Structure 1
Amino acid sequence: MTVPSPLADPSIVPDPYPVYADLAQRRPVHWVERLNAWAVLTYADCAAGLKDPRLTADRGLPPDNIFHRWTKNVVMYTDPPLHDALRRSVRAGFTRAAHQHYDQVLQKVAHDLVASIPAGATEIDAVPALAAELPVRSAVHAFGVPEEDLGFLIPRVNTIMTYVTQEIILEKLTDLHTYASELLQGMRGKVLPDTVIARLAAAQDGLTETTPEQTVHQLALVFIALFAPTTPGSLSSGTLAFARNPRQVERFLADQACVDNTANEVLRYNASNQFTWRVAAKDVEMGGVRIEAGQTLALFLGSANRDANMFERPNDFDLDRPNSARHLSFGQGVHACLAAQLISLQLKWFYVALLNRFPGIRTAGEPIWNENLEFRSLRSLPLSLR
């Protein structure tokens, strides 16, 4: 627990993959002091870890604080059986029928955003112009966040997501709860019909295994996830991958199977959430290391996704890869991303619109990355359009 590791250093965020690969070969499970946790780097160990009921997500200041009340009442930080009740209680937003509707909505929203870039424009910064914007348009039109309430919501989520005191974070999380409960009573903006939130709102008279107060907690989680840097990061990193791989732009334009695999290969190529957290409920052994009950683990999804044992030539962005769907960028098992299909639709329709209008995208200078590996996301992506 005293051996140095570079994994929590901002210096590796621009390109963490050679670091992951060097460390995995020698110490696939090892202690990272700045994370206060055991890093887990291989695909096999990350996948086992996500499936392991001995590893809890219940990670939970005065004891009645809102962070504790929130975490103990949302799917992301609870274990079965409560987790499973909480997850069933939001199923109405994410049915097969709902996704057939979101498919159509997201095709149009992505098309219209890309079409708003003048055809004669020669350059853009694809992060603010596109990657930051499409998730907001999707939040409004697919999820049903009222357009008129974005001024309230987005800056508060940005503050909560800061890489600012503990007091301020508790205040903004309190505000999200206030907003969520008032939204459901018609006191805030108008929720568009047939959206995720409209469906959840209509389901509230039918609760059987969760409480109205838990709906409020979970909606606060949804707002944080919606405006987190994860969706922008996926959009911008995939845009960079196409800009650096013109042969894959060609394959995308030539082959519907490549289009169909684009969301998953983009997600595999760069996990936005490069690691997620677990706590050992009981002693476990991983990577030859005895991890004791109570200790924290960081499962490096981003490393797993470039493990050559699962993905041959893992550093190739390859739309013809046959097993891209095995990526761990949405996790796996109990806590697998609630919005996985919504996100993959958003990604698919973005690249359809982008590469048909601007097949000639290329970088116009070096991309600039952020400094937080956990929520890894380009700050700027200067892009020539022609």
Structure 2
Amino acid sequence: PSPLADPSIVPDPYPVYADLAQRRPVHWVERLNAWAVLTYADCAAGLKDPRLTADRGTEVLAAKFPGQPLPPDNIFHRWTKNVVMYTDPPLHDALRRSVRAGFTRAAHQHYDQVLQKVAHDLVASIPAGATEIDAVPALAAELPVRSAVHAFGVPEEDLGFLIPRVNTIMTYYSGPKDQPVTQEIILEKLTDLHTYASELLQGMRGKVLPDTVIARLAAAQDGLTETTPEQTVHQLALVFIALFAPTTPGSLSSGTLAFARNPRQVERFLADQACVDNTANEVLRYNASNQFTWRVAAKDVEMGGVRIEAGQTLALFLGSANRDANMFERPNDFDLDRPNSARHLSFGQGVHACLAAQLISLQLKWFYVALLNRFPGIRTAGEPIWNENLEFRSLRSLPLSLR
């Protein structure tokens, strides 16, 4: 019976992942209704294997809410079948092109400057007499919300509507454990994000800051020719979910912990710009926030000596792949001098590689620039405590001393 379904692995899964990558690199996890895939080689190729489809909302819903299917007209199916995350090419590619205006080279030139300032301002807000901080609520949870506002264009005044709704929706992705929130409630909040997205663009909600992702997307709508208004609304809903997911906080907090525990890496960062430049990727490699991602077999495939039949579900363990010693020597070392950290799988790979990958790496880079030049002596001030979630894994508490 798979140790991947044991809640006790979440604080430190890596010894279990390493053992299973060796002995059981592909194996069945009953609680996921899926084949777990543990090695870098199999995860990276699986992400780019056209025999594995991203059209998986049916299968994954059946895994998470067995006995509770939904019809094709239900918001769950209309959303999944009309967003980049859960579509294959060619539709995927039309949907991705339709959001290009938010993510151009010029746009990221602007976001680089916004994020530098946002992170600067966050860290500068920590009072002089503060030696202790819980880096989760104070910093890791906070930076992504300030980025959502200033770089993405989510109105600040609408955060009270969005934050709790995304937190509810995100319980869908609770890993191999009982669902804490009913399907009915999740679908209601998913519906609510669609209403909000459409009303935001109509000017019925908050004010979107200029030159942000959402402002750019809004201005692009008149020129779209291969997608529909409903598709834009579906895609915004996904964007809201991704913006307020625990992914970015977990990356910030797990990287902060890594620095706290590895002071010579602080020294490296302050000594060598190449180590700065590699910080986002080494942090992303060191702990994938999304530890596994889902696929379905569109055709029979063979992986890890297992024949996976068309229609079966797979869980590609990005978090295990990132610490596979065959790809990353001494994979449990947090090492800014590592030469291949950019090979991590935390943003996936290929067709569905994270749309926000550059935005998030800029956010991480500027955070650590600000934090570590202010407070190079960061250390633990108690036990870091993890959320009870393997799928989207993150710290709930990170007590630190700043000096």
TM-score normalized with structure 2 length: 0.94
Contact kept? 1:111, 1:350, Cα under 8 Å: yes
CA distance in 2, matches of 1:14, 1:190: 40
Q: Deviations over 1:115-158 (max 9, x none)?
A: 11112211000000000000000000000000000011000001
Contact kept? 1:242, 1:249, Cα under 8 Å: yes
Q: Deviations over 1:324-354 (max 9, x none)?
A: 0000000000000000000000000000000
Contact kept? 1:274, 1:303, Cα under 8 Å: yes
Match of 1:189 among 194, 198, 206: 206
CA distance in 1, matches of 2:248, 2:220: 26
Contact kept? 2:72, 2:78, Cα under 8 Å: no
Alpha-carbon shift at residue 8 of structure 1 (Å): 2.2
Consecutive unaligned residues of structure 1, counting only runs of 5 or more, are: none
Q: Kindly tell me the number of residue pairs found equivalent between the two proteins.
A: 382
SS at match of 1:143: coil
CA distance in 2, matches of 1:384, 1:163: 34
Contact kept? 1:160, 1:172, Cα under 8 Å: yes
SS at match of 1:162: helix
CA distance in 2, matches of 1:125, 1:111: 18
Would you identify which runs of 4 or more consecutive aligned residues in structure 1 move more than 6 Å?
none
SS at match of 2:294: strand
Contact kept? 2:281, 2:361, Cα under 8 Å: yes
Alpha-carbon shift at residue 9 of structure 1 (Å): 2.1
Aligned to 1:46: 43
Alpha-carbon shift at residue 63 of structure 1 (Å): 3.5
Change (3 A) 1:163 1:204: closer
CA distance in 1, matches of 2:19, 2:140: 31
Match of 2:233 among 203, 216, 221: 216
Q: Deviations over 1:90-132 (max 9, x none)?
A: 0000000000000000000000001111122110000000000
Q: Deviations over 1:281-315 (max 9, x none)?
A: 00000000000000000000000000111111100
CA distance in 1, matches of 2:82, 2:270: 45
Change (3 A) 1:129 1:87: same
Contact kept? 1:163, 1:372, Cα under 8 Å: no
Match of 1:146 among 140, 150, 155: 155
CA distance in 1, matches of 2:92, 2:34: 24
Contact kept? 2:291, 2:390, Cα under 8 Å: yes
Contact kept? 2:172, 2:186, Cα under 8 Å: no
SS at match of 1:277: strand
Q: Which moved more, 1:161-170 or 1:216-225?
A: 161-170
SS at match of 1:297: strand
CA distance in 2, matches of 1:10, 1:379: 15
Contact kept? 2:140, 2:253, Cα under 8 Å: yes
Q: Deviations over 1:199-219 (max 9, x none)?
A: 000000011111111000000
CA distance in 2, matches of 1:46, 1:383: 34
Q: Deviations over 1:259-297 (max 9, x none)?
A: 000000000000000000000000000000000000000
SS at match of 1:257: helix
Aligned to 2:100: 91
Contact kept? 1:55, 1:281, Cα under 8 Å: yes
Aligned to 1:366: 383
List aligned pairs for 1:178-257, cutoff 5 A: 178-257=195-274
Alpha-carbon shift at residue 163 of structure 1 (Å): 6.0
Alpha-carbon shift at residue 59 of structure 1 (Å): 1.2
Aligned to 2:6: 9
Contact kept? 2:2, 2:28, Cα under 8 Å: yes
CA distance in 2, matches of 1:238, 1:167: 36
Alpha-carbon shift at residue 41 of structure 1 (Å): 0.3
Alpha-carbon shift at residue 251 of structure 1 (Å): 0.2
SS at match of 1:383: strand
CA distance in 2, matches of 1:303, 1:91: 31
